[PDB]
Amino acid sequence: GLIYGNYLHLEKVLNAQELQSETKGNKIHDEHLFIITHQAYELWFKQILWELDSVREIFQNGHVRDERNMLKVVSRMHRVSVILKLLVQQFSILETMTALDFNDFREYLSPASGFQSLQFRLLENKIGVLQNMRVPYYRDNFKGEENELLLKSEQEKTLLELVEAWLERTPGLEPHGFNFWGKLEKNITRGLEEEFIRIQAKEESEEKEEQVAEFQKQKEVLLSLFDEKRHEHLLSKGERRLSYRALQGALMIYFYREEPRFQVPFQLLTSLMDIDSLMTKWRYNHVCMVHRMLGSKAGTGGSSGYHYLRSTVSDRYKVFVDLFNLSTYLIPRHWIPKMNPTIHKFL
Amino acid sequence: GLIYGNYLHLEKVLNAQELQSETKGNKIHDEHLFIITHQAYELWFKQILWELDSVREIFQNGHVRDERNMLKVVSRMHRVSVILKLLVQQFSILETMTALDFNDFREYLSPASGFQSLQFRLLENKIGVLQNMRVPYNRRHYRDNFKGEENELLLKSEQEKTLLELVEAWLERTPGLEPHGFNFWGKLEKNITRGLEEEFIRIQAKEESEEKEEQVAEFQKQKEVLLSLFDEKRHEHLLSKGERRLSYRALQGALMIYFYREEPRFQVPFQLLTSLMDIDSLMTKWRYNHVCMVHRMLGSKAGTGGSSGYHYLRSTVSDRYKVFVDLFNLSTYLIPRHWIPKMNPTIHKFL
Amino acid sequence: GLIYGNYLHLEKVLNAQELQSETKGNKIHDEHLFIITHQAYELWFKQILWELDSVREIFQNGHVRDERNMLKVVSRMHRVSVILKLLVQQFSILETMTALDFNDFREYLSPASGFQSLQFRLLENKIGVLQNMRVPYRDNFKGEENELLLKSEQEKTLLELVEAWLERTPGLEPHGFNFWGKLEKNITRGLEEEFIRIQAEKEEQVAEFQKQKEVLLSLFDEKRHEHLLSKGERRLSYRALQGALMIYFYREEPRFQVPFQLLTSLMDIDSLMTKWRYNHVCMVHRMLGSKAGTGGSSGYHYLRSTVSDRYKVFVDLFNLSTYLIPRHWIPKMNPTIHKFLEH
Amino acid sequence: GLIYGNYLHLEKVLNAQELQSETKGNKIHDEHLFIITHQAYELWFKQILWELDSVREIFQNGHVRDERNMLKVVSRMHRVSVILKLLVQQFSILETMTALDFNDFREYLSPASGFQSLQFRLLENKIGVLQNMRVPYNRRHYRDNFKGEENELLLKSEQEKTLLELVEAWLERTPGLEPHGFNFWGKLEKNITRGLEEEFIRIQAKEESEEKEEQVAEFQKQKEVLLSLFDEKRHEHLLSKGERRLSYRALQGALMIYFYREEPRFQVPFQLLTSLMDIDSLMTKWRYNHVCMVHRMLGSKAGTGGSSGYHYLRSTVSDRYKVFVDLFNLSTYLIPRHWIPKMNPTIHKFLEH
Numbered sequence A: 001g002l003i004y005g006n007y008l009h010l011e012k013v014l015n016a017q018e019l020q021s022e023t024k025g026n027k028i029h030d031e032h033l034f035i036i037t038h039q040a041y042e043l044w045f046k047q048i049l050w051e052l053d054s055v056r057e058i059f060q061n062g063h064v065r066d067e068r069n070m071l072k073v074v075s076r077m078h079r080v081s082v083i084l085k086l087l088v089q090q091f092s093i094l095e096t097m098t099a100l101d102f103n104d105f106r107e108y109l110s111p112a113s114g115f116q117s118l119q120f121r122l123l124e125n126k127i128g129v130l131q132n133m134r135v136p137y138y139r140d141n142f143k144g145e146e147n148e149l150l151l152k153s154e155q156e157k158t159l160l161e162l163v164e165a166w167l168e169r170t171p172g173l174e175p176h177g178f179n180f181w182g183k184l185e186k187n188i189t190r191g192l193e194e195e196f197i198r199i200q201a202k203e204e205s206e207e208k209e210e211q212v213a214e215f216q217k218q219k220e221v222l223l224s225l226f227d228e229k230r231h232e233h234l235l236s237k238g239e240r241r242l243s244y245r246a247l248q249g250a251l252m253i254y255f256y257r258e259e260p261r262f263q264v265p266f267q268l269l270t271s272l273m274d275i276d277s278l279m280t281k282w283r284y285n286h287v288c289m290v291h292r293m294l295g296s297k298a299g300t301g302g303s304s305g306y307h308y309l310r311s312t313v314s315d316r317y318k319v320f321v322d323l324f325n326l327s328t329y330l331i332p333r334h335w336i337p338k339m340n341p342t343i344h345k346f347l
Numbered sequence B: 001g002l003i004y005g006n007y008l009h010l011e012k013v014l015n016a017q018e019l020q021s022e023t024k025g026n027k028i029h030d031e032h033l034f035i036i037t038h039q040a041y042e043l044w045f046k047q048i049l050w051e052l053d054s055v056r057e058i059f060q061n062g063h064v065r066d067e068r069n070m071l072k073v074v075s076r077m078h079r080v081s082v083i084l085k086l087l088v089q090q091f092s093i094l095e096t097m098t099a100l101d102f103n104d105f106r107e108y109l110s111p112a113s114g115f116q117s118l119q120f121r122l123l124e125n126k127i128g129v130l131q132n133m134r135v136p137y138n139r140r141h142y143r144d145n146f147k148g149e150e151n152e153l154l155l156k157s158e159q160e161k162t163l164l165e166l167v168e169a170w171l172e173r174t175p176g177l178e179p180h181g182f183n184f185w186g187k188l189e190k191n192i193t194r195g196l197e198e199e200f201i202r203i204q205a206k207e208e209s210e211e212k213e214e215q216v217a218e219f220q221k222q223k224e225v226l227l228s229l230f231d232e233k234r235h236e237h238l239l240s241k242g243e244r245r246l247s248y249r250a251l252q253g254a255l256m257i258y259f260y261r262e263e264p265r266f267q268v269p270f271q272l273l274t275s276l277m278d279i280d281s282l283m284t285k286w287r288y289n290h291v292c293m294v295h296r297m298l299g300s301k302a303g304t305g306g307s308s309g310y311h312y313l314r315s316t317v318s319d320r321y322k323v324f325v326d327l328f329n330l331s332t333y334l335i336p337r338h339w340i341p342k343m344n345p346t347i348h349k350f351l
Numbered sequence C: 001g002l003i004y005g006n007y008l009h010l011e012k013v014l015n016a017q018e019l020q021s022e023t024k025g026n027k028i029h030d031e032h033l034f035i036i037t038h039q040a041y042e043l044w045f046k047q048i049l050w051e052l053d054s055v056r057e058i059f060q061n062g063h064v065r066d067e068r069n070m071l072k073v074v075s076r077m078h079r080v081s082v083i084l085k086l087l088v089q090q091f092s093i094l095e096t097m098t099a100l101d102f103n104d105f106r107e108y109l110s111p112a113s114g115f116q117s118l119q120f121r122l123l124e125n126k127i128g129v130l131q132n133m134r135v136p137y138r139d140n141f142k143g144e145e146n147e148l149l150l151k152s153e154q155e156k157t158l159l160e161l162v163e164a165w166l167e168r169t170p171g172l173e174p175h176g177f178n179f180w181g182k183l184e185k186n187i188t189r190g191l192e193e194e195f196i197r198i199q200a201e202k203e204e205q206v207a208e209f210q211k212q213k214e215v216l217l218s219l220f221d222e223k224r225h226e227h228l229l230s231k232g233e234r235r236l237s238y239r240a241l242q243g244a245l246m247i248y249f250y251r252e253e254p255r256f257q258v259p260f261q262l263l264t265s266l267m268d269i270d271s272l273m274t275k276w277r278y279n280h281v282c283m284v285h286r287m288l289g290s291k292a293g294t295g296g297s298s299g300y301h302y303l304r305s306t307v308s309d310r311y312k313v314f315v316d317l318f319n320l321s322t323y324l325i326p327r328h329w330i331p332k333m334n335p336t337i338h339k340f341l342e343h
Numbered sequence D: 001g002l003i004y005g006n007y008l009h010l011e012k013v014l015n016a017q018e019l020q021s022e023t024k025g026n027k028i029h030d031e032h033l034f035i036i037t038h039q040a041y042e043l044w045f046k047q048i049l050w051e052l053d054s055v056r057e058i059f060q061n062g063h064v065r066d067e068r069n070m071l072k073v074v075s076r077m078h079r080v081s082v083i084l085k086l087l088v089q090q091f092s093i094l095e096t097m098t099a100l101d102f103n104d105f106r107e108y109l110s111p112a113s114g115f116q117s118l119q120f121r122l123l124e125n126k127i128g129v130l131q132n133m134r135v136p137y138n139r140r141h142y143r144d145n146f147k148g149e150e151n152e153l154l155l156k157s158e159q160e161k162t163l164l165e166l167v168e169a170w171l172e173r174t175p176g177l178e179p180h181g182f183n184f185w186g187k188l189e190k191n192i193t194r195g196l197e198e199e200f201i202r203i204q205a206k207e208e209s210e211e212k213e214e215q216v217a218e219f220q221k222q223k224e225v226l227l228s229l230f231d232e233k234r235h236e237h238l239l240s241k242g243e244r245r246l247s248y249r250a251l252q253g254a255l256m257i258y259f260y261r262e263e264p265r266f267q268v269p270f271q272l273l274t275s276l277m278d279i280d281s282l283m284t285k286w287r288y289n290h291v292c293m294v295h296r297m298l299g300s301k302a303g304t305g306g307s308s309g310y311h312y313l314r315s316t317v318s319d320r321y322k323v324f325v326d327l328f329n330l331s332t333y334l335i336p337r338h339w340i341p342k343m344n345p346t347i348h349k350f351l352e353h
């Protein structure tokens, strides 16, 4: 019964290539590569959305609470990063088209543009790209059911929100349990006092002063971790994304990552940072290619082109910026609150 | 006005995903990845066919005679190797599927298989894989997967001039082969004979030892192989055994381009021969990346397509599928620079 | 204060390039690429040995028994896979050397060869390639190096250390969860239940079933395992094989999640090691055609023979995919066993 | 008899791994990966310099004039691209180190940093990064990080002819620019003037609508930009600001090679100009891969080298470091195929091998 071509619906996939250059009586060879490249990107965007929606659902329905499901969650998020690595490398194919050959069919593209990629916007919204923090110069380019899908993607819970809620339930944050945050503040305070005492002991000098100057900056940054009102301020400015408690959960997972219950959660947090890193690399690879194709010419979508695309390579689009910035507060191993054999048994 | 999704016919591309697991009311999540991965490979096969047919046409219609067209030829053949590099890497995506999760939807695939990939067979044929070259199982079982217009397209792909045949005819016309002109082959036989005579004298001069006795036997091996190049009867014998594919005169053209590659008229031609070897290497790396994956997916299990599975696929990782094997094997006959026939001012100007 | 160049000992690393063509009064430009490529490969071989020895020691010193060390074990084995991926890709650099430019300095290399790569042999040995299964190596070494290589053959391999760990896999104990007994029962019921279905298209369905029955029930023949094991065609003990299959089937159970990742990584390393070998083959074919190597091998022909399951140490982890069954056949796990496989 | 290990001097290469964490009696496992990764980069930087210096010399000694050398020049410049491609991908290895594990040995590194990579600075200089276009970090020149011979070597790298200067000189001699010959620049201005006039007449002829106002606006913009290409004084201004790098005549040569790339004598030259943009693109991609990894390693911590760290590195991902920016920006002035000045059989014959 089942045949390869029918199974893969190749009657659709391999009959979707219509050169506008040809339609308008001036067939240009490289337009075919241009079409295929975009169609391959859109297939992989569909796969990323399939994986991403399935992970969002595992969080939203509480399946993530059952830790049996963590291999599936980390495997699928790792799989998204493996797909994004290919999409970054895939620009190398379209770069075998010269700007001069591109120029021969560019006129037939106006006013279509990548601003009309539904799936790219769905992908951005569902990971959790800030709606206000987008570069000043998006949903205007969409109508009908597509506009509806995009609104759903903006209103439904993002991977960021769902990871946030899960980080807020991380074991060990309980003030009457392990009391991670209280102990951490106590240990950092005591650690810094002892570091100062031994800087003071040294003989007055340009070096000692440099050492005091650096200690004072590091002290201010480390203790700023414990300033909740500062966090709330930076939250409202969109410079941070995660709730204060979610930050505590993530830092708990970082410090105690070798504890069996935190091993795969540490892999997940690593994977989320990988996905942000590969999405900005996708953007910058797109940028470097567009510079060769357009120079300083305006895009068919109405943007300044090259200059606009450069502005999207920015932490404005880094959804898990907080997971990166937590590296600001790494401390000597021996300052990390100790685990009692009971804390160990629970993890 | 033109819209992105309309331009790219995404109403077809993004409505072509039907999970057979779901159609039998037992939806398996990873079947979606399986479908997208094959669909992406088939889009790229279609692009390779588009590049490959355009280059076949440039050879067939004689446009290749105008050397203005050589940048276009080498760019498109290089583009094929860049696409094949991505397709080799693309297996890393499907390797994120465990054998256990694959096993949950495999039953819904039978009897469909990669043997029913029309485009993969069109690609093999159009580069110039011959029915004889295919491993016994593959040889006849390959055409028997296709009916109607699909079978018509495969017949055409075998009946029409292959890239091998078209490159061969072009290599036969390589400037410098002309016995009345630069007479490459005559001068090469003379210089290699003279070169071997000087080498035999150098070795014969050496103080007697074990190391001399070794060099003598090694020299005698190299002399046998190098002088065998000029035995056209031996060339024809190896053609019939399928050990060589190119005509004797095309082989001479290939060596001309290798030795004189820096001559301006042979610069892009040398890039093209490099690209043809690249495409053979990447086709066989594609085959071997597929083998390594299938081994983890099936172990010793037989394929849905009817083959032994892992064991069959290993047999396709063979030089019998290497269309431009002769371009690789010409490295057997590389000689010291100072043995290569000199070009005087007259022949340099012509190139 | 520490300085970058001093820290990295670049006084050594960047003063280690001597072109033999230039030493013999005939400097060939592309020999520099040739030297750097091999040196970069050897640095990464050293890094893989560093990771692989550290993981061997975690198994051998008992620390792997502490399941808090599994993240470290899988990260380091995954790191080996990421290094090998780069090393496969790294052939693309040396392939920018034409066979004709290589031919200009090849004469200065004899009789040196890759057969004299100490680290490559150490890597093969330490993963657990056995000397009797090698395609017809220590003859190429002397003194301290021949010594290090004998140690690499005599000391516990990653295959042996993983074998011993797989034998202790929870759920195998006959008095306990009794996985192997339960699995045989369920596959026996599974097959005779399908025969009943099939016997009630119809010709080929009877043939395919008897093929499947024969193979599946052959899994339970321990005598047959020991035969193929002694004949070098299998590598893991029968109990280790049961552990592996336990981890495959129950991989989602928290305590088996990172172990499954580890089994996936061991298969990735075999796959990438053979891909390294095959990329080396594809390049050497263009460089040499049918010429014999400076090492005294047939060259291209000998290298092809190393692209075989003779060199696939974890071949058993691949072949376990032969014996995969419908998931409803897998012995159900009660709340008693489920709680034992929680962290 | 030559031995593998002796040939590759592995007695040096594989005895250069000293963990500072171990030297201070606290050995950290991942410091070994850190050291090997930097050592591999430096081996490849040396190979890039070897290729780059060989190609600089082929231009400088005048051998580039004999067009039989063009396969060698393009092969070696493409080889630099292939190496840089691997170096971009190589960051994936060091990314298998967590920020937590890096934090366990970071203390033993200060005040060493990548600001002290002689070869990275040599590479930047020899391609043609402007010293006055470099981003500052401590109000002083990057070369303050170097002393003695290293400082001298970097000075020579700044002073000696860069790849940009050598390519520039060669572009100025591009056949077809000579006003008494093919007169490319004269014909191009004439053809663009005509092209724009015929384009205006076509817009003038449409019925008054938003579509016309769009086309009139879009047209007068394209008109301004294209005609600007012929303003030599505008080019000289932008050249002094460092917004352009190539002389006006070199720019003409590059555009000649773009438009007539298929002419046999311009085929390998067009490949070279493509390779030069690839190298700019792969160097900036190296910088951004470095940036993305460093964000996870340090967050907003200051660098051992005295920079702001992540924030400073983001500022080097900039057209300040794009040496062949003019080759990219020429795509601004691409025109319809039929506007390109026609080649008669005489110039066709002079641009054949």
Ligand code: HEM
Pocket (backbone or CB within 6 Å): A037, A038, A041, A042, A094, A102, A113, A114, A115, A117, A120, A286, A289, A290, A293, A294, A298, A299, A300, A301, A302, A303, A304, A305, A306, A308, A309, A312
């Ligand atoms: C010759 C190749 C390409 C050129 C010249 C190009 C040009 C542009 C330009 C100028 C923009 C900004 C909007 C505008 O004014 O049009 C843009 C945005 C975009 N392009 Fe491309 N593009 C190319 C290839 C691709 C490919 C292969 C993809 C694959 C999906 C893609 C996806 C996008 C997306 C998703 C956007 C929206 C990005 C954002 O707003 O952040 N582009 N492109």
Ligand code: HEM
Pocket (backbone or CB within 6 Å): B037, B038, B041, B042, B094, B102, B113, B114, B115, B117, B120, B138, B290, B293, B294, B297, B298, B302, B303, B304, B305, B306, B307, B308, B309, B310, B312, B313, B316
């Ligand atoms: C789980 C993944 C895969 C498995 C288990 C698999 C298995 C097989 C098997 C067993 C065969 C031999 C014919 C048969 O008996 O069925 C085969 C052939 C083939 N497969 Fe795959 N395959 C996989 C993925 C892919 C992908 C992604 C492609 C992409 C196009 C592909 C393309 C082919 C082609 C073209 C053939 C025919 C090759 C030849 O005859 O030389 N396969 N595959």
Ligand code: HEM
Pocket (backbone or CB within 6 Å): C037, C038, C041, C042, C094, C102, C113, C114, C115, C117, C120, C280, C283, C284, C287, C288, C292, C293, C294, C295, C296, C297, C298, C299, C300, C302, C303, C306
């Ligand atoms: C032009 C490039 C190369 C050629 C022609 C070449 C050739 C050969 C040949 C002929 C052999 C078989 C032994 C012999 O007869 O000499 C061999 C083995 C080997 N080569 Fe290479 N090789 C090349 C590049 C490399 C590189 C870059 C590495 C990196 C370390 C390498 C590592 C090895 C190793 C480890 C072996 C032993 C493999 C085994 O016994 O399975 N080769 N090579």
Ligand code: HEM
Pocket (backbone or CB within 6 Å): D037, D038, D041, D042, D094, D102, D113, D114, D115, D117, D120, D290, D293, D294, D297, D298, D302, D303, D304, D305, D306, D307, D308, D309, D310, D312, D313, D316
């Ligand atoms: C954990 C990994 C790494 C970290 C955290 C790191 C951090 C930094 C930082 C902070 C700087 C700015 C100067 C400073 O204040 O120290 C820098 C510059 C640099 N790093 Fe790295 N780096 C890493 C890996 C590497 C590697 C593997 C290379 C390989 C050569 C490298 C090469 C450089 C170079 C050349 C610079 C100077 C770049 C410029 O000025 O534009 N780094 N790095």
Ligand SMILES: N[C@@H](Cc1c[nH]c2ccccc12)C(=O)O
Pocket (backbone or CB within 6 Å): A064, A065, A066, A067, A166, A167, A168, A169, A170, A171, A253, A261, A262, A265
């Ligand atoms: N699985 C539990 C506990 C939990 C929440 N966040 C975590 C992070 C790491 C480990 C466990 C947890 C839950 O989802 O509520």
Ligand SMILES: N[C@@H](Cc1c[nH]c2ccccc12)C(=O)O
Pocket (backbone or CB within 6 Å): A038, A106, A109, A110, A112, A113, A114, A294, A298, A299, A300, A301, A305, B004, B007
């Ligand atoms: N926006 C591109 C054109 C383009 C790129 N990708 C596309 C996909 C569809 C339609 C148009 C495009 C330009 O300005 O040149």
Ligand SMILES: N[C@@H](Cc1c[nH]c2ccccc12)C(=O)O
Pocket (backbone or CB within 6 Å): B064, B065, B066, B067, B170, B171, B172, B173, B174, B175, B257, B265, B266, B269
């Ligand atoms: N272009 C000419 C001459 C030619 C044939 N083969 C070649 C190989 C290399 C260079 C030139 C040629 C032709 O097609 O007949």
Ligand SMILES: N[C@@H](Cc1c[nH]c2ccccc12)C(=O)O
Pocket (backbone or CB within 6 Å): A004, A007, B038, B106, B109, B112, B113, B114, B298, B302, B303, B304, B305, B309
């Ligand atoms: N032949 C494969 C199944 C398979 C792989 N790729 C496919 C694509 C379409 C249909 C079936 C397949 C097997 O034996 O398991």
Ligand SMILES: N[C@@H](Cc1c[nH]c2ccccc12)C(=O)O
Pocket (backbone or CB within 6 Å): C064, C065, C066, C067, C165, C166, C168, C169, C170, C247, C255, C256, C259
């Ligand atoms: N950690 C225990 C139990 C164990 C052995 N092998 C395993 C495999 C998976 C999970 C647990 C185990 C041990 O080393 O003896």
Ligand SMILES: N[C@@H](Cc1c[nH]c2ccccc12)C(=O)O
Pocket (backbone or CB within 6 Å): C038, C106, C109, C112, C113, C114, C288, C292, C293, C294, C295, C299, D004, D007
């Ligand atoms: N064995 C290779 C030469 C070779 C490859 N890699 C080497 C490293 C060191 C010494 C020699 C080599 C040949 O036969 O051509």
Ligand SMILES: N[C@@H](Cc1c[nH]c2ccccc12)C(=O)O
Pocket (backbone or CB within 6 Å): D064, D065, D066, D067, D170, D171, D172, D173, D174, D175, D257, D265, D266, D269
């Ligand atoms: N080879 C000649 C002519 C030349 C200069 N630049 C070029 C660019 C492309 C083609 C030829 C040239 C020279 O060096 O003066």
Ligand SMILES: N[C@@H](Cc1c[nH]c2ccccc12)C(=O)O
Pocket (backbone or CB within 6 Å): C004, C007, D038, D106, D109, D110, D112, D113, D114, D298, D302, D303, D304, D305, D309
């Ligand atoms: N500058 C880095 C440390 C570093 C990265 N690479 C190095 C090489 C040598 C010495 C130090 C380094 C930091 O701030 O953490």
